[PDB]
């Protein structure tokens, strides 16, 4: 159902997030909270940025 009245706020509601990039797919009903930095291409980023 629509939940605009509480969740949304002006200027950007950044409380809830999502994984834009993952190394693999997801098994059903599996919760991932690793939130670890992901590297693409030549995966050279062993650091932070």
């Amino acid at each position, epitope marked *: 159902w*629509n939940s*605009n*009245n*509480l969740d949304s*706020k*002006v*200027g950007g509601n950044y409380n809830y997030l999502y994984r834009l990039f993952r190394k693999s797919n997801l098994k059903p009903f599996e919760r991932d909270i690793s939130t670890e930095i992901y590297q693409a291409g030549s995966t050279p980023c062993n650091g932070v940025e």
Partner: antibody
Amino acid sequence: QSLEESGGDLVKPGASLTLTCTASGFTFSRYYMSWVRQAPGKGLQWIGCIDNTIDTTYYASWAKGRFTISKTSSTTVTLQMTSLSAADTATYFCARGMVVVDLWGPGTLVTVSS
Amino acid sequence: QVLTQTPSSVSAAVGGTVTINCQSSQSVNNNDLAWYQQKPGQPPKLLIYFVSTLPSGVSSRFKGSGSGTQFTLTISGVQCDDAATYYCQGGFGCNSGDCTAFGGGTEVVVKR
């Protein structure tokens, strides 16, 4: 983040007119939009609104069939008007949102006279 | 579908609390009422939305009450710069009583 309207000019009654508000810094495909009018000596009233999926259906009851709203491209939305009357004189603001709005453009007045 | 702004005109002082009543003919859709302050010659600015939730970047003086058919706005004080007409933007369960509506103006004057 800004909006700017265009197309306000003196036009005889019964002639079609094209209005247009353009979005700067963002595209009219994520943020809700609305079309509103404010007469110089009368309250504010809304006419049309469309964003994302086809949403043009929502129109004012008094507006009837002479009011249509369509976005020509991603950043510009045009307004088409028919059957102009002396009671249609008002200031046209490009609202941003159906029930809640953040910021509008300066507003282009469209006066109707013969 | 037309929302009545009772009273149409409201007068208050700088340190005097401000109240206003906006009544809706029909029940609103899931608390979708909004409020905008329309300074003359310029489109209105947001002050309170969803009855009571405060937008980001506005003064901490506007608080809203009521739900369903009756709603009200309460302002703790005025810094003489809030002289504008307030429009209670009534979201409706759309396709019934139009799809949304705007009420009448309610400007606040300050006597000095």
